[PDB]
Amino acid sequence: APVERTGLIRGLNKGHKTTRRVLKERPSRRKGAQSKRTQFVRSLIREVAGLAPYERRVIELLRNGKDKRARKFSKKKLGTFGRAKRKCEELQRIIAESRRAH
Amino acid sequence: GALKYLEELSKKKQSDVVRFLLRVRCWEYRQLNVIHRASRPSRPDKARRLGYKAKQGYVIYRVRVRRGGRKRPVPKGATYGKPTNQGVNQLKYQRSLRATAEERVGRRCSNLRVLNSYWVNQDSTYKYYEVILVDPNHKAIRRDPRINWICNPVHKHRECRGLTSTGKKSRGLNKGHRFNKTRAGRRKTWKRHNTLSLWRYR
Amino acid sequence: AIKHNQQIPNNHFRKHWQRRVRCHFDQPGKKVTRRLARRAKAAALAPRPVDKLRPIVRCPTVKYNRRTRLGRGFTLEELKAAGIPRLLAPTIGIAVDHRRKNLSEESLAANVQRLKDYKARLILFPRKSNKPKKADTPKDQQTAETTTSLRTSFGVEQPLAPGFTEISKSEIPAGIEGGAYRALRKARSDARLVGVREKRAKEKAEAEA
Amino acid sequence: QEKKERLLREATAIKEGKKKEDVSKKPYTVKYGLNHVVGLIENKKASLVLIAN
RNA sequence: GUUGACCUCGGAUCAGGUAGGAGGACCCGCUGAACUUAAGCAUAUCAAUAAGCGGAGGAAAAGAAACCAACAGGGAUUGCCCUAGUAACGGCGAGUGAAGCGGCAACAGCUCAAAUUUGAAAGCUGGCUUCGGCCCGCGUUGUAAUUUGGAGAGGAUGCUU
RNA sequence: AAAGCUCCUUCGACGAGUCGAGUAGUUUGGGAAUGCUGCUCAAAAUGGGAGGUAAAUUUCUUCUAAAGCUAAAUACCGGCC
């Protein structure tokens, strides 16, 4: 019983009165979940492969430098604002693990 | 197993390890013929994903194309028409370079059937592909029911009829409100909308 | 070239329409062909009904919301409630649809009853006559009158609600306090101002702090 | 060719009345195959790996 | 040094096989006009059409959702009636122009990559054979069984097929 | 030997020069750009696409792309009757 319908149309919560029920989650909706088998593989490959030229320019400019420029530049390469924001956040993690470890 | 790591490694095509390995191979190519046999696939994970198997009757060929854009072939520049369609230089072909590569291989091997193809390498004036072929007359093929569907006489030369994976992309073969005019065949629907039907009792 | 008081014409007849004209002179000839195919099919399925069982479904739009009709198949939850194996259902005339869900409880209850009584009316011949099994008919009640349509014998009983109802006086309810007309106007303007009111109230809380 | 004798040895025993795994013993062999080997080292069961160059 | 393997590339009137041409009314693609209409004409229209080129069948193609919706929610594809001369495009001129819902005909669902059989490549082409089988080869850079999101795997548990 | 059903702490692998973005030509009823193709850049894991007006912030609904098969209702007088 998520929400109770009012019973009259043309309102904030319009609808027809009924007894809604909760249902078991379908397996098709588990697409984006992380798996421990794929995190192990993706971590090892990053060590072997290394970084890319456009990442190397942002990561240097991201530390001891501007942060707006690091996000203007990322958008121009990746092409969209949403992906640029996520990529910049992930690279901030790699700098944190490197220097703060030892 | 190991095939999982190859999937992840091939995603990073800008790393120093991968970029070096593509440069050396492209020089190894371009010294052989335009079309030539390949002993074994160079991308074992990618070929396996598309139906390739390591048993008799499966062969691999590779080919390159010119990587440009279509220029309208006319004597000099004259077109003899209205100004709206007298351009010659910036026109474009309506099928992908991947499709042309598959088609030339089919004429070379006229007794086999084309399954799929994939991108291998590219250059300033060339793009390289590898094509998977299947022998429809081998006994080891007709025995297995997972593939013997291809031996039927209805799958003859499906390269130039637009039935492979790249052929379905070049046509609007998808569901939804976006692919309206070409969902079931562009020319078929144009016939349906332009027919005048008369019944006995009007 | 218009000349008098006329309606402006628009006749899409400037292409080569004459090349694509589809006259229907085979309307009665085609009908005979279908009737020959149905009775030929019915002979092949000698004791079985021709059709398949369908569930009850409501139309999906605000217009047509009132009426009901037949659907494609029963959801996997409906079959489980009635105790029918998933694999055995398609082989005894039941149609299954695996991409439909039961959001409410009214639809779920109606279909379960419609499927439960079908199981009671089913006669199931054994695979081998000399060795019958537990779930088979014991050969005593195999002889009975049968139906073949299964679309008329199991159609929608009534698609619409009853036209009217008659109730005794002094049982008539009282309306909304403001009235029916004013209840609609208030509900309309409340949704328009849901954003303006919320932020004005919220910013006051931070303003005082 | 060796596998044939072991299979025939099993057939004689199973007909007499003694079940399988009573005439044969646990085998110790070297592993091979790329996908097979990769799984072995992920479970820390391998002790030494040799790779071609 | 001798000798024996592996990978790549060739010869042969080696053993066994396969493609071309015809037809093209209907069907799947590429390429691509102008006459004409606008009372002139260049965007537009004729037309995503004629001619040209490639590939199949008795039908071809499509097809088991990265869909439609905003509802009390529908549920693979194709065709007929309606939606509709409608929303929309257009020297907003001449003109062009779909889709969702709804009724009916006919109805049917499925297999691969990504997991170690690892206590036993359990799989296959070919040759010879008295018909019981044997031999070389392909293959571990992966041939069978098992799994495909509707799930499933791994555990519990009693009946049934 | 193989198969079906009822429950569960826990696991639950899912397709890349692809998706997407910019620019150019063609096309569509698709209108700050419906589909297709050329060039440059080039992703992610509750992630991704869509929700018919461009952009930022916060919610919600619905499916699971980049591999594959399959009868019937439909067209046609070209071939044999």
Segment holding C56, helix H or strand E? strand C56-58
CA C82 to CA C89: how far, in whole Å? 11
Final resolution, Å: 3.1
Angle between helices C194-208 and C180-192 (to 10 degrees): 60
Which amino acid makes up residue C185?
R
Comparing alpha-carbon positions, the chain B residue that sits nearest to C20 is B195
**C191 shares contact with chain A (CB less than 8 Å):** yes
CA B15 to CA A102: how far, in whole Å? 26
Which of the 15-74 residues on chain A come under 7 Å of nucleic strand F at their beta carbon? 27-38, 42, 52-54
Query: Of C125, C120, C104, whose CA–CA distance to C48 is shortest?
Result: C125
- Which string of b and e fits A14-34 if b means at least 16 CB within 10 Å? eeeeeeeeeeeeeeeeeeeee
φ, ψ at B193 (rounded to 5°): -75, -20
CA C16 to CA C131: how far, in whole Å? 70
Q: CA A37 – C1' E144 distance (Å)?
A: 27
Chain C residue numbers touching A23 (CB-CB < 8 A): 77, 101-103
Residue B52 is assigned to a ligand binding site: no
Q: CA C14 – C1' E37 distance (Å)?
A: 9
